[PDB]
Amino acid sequence: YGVSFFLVKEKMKGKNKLVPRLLGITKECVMRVDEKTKEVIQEWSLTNIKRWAASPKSFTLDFGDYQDGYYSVQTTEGEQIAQLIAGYIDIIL
């Protein structure tokens, strides 16, 4: 078991709704992947996580609360993203 991938929705510019997207949890980071290309648009250390929050419709990460550390998206499988993340911070800690 290695890097994990989750199709999540994100709030982009140009409209007001969310845009399907693709997340990638790495035992060293978290990233916003372009479901379109599968390439990474964003990255964020997993060992940098402060506290996250998976939901039945969405999931969220809290890293940077100093200012704005809250990065979230829409996904009907958070506990899957979160348990792993949670399980990954368990490693890299």
């Binding site: 994100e10 709030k11 982009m12 510019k13 007001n16 969310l18 506290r51 996250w52 929050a53 939901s55 969405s58 969220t60 809290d62 809250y70 979230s72 998206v73």
Partner: peptide, 24 residues
């Protein structure tokens, strides 16, 4: 330390549906 986190992040998530997003 768990307690409200869920609601503490969900309340924040509301800001992702409001209208802004990331304010770049």
């Amino acid at each position: 330390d768990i307690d409200q986190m869920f609601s503490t992040l969900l309340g924040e998530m509301d800001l992702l549906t409001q209208s802004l997003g990331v304010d770049t």
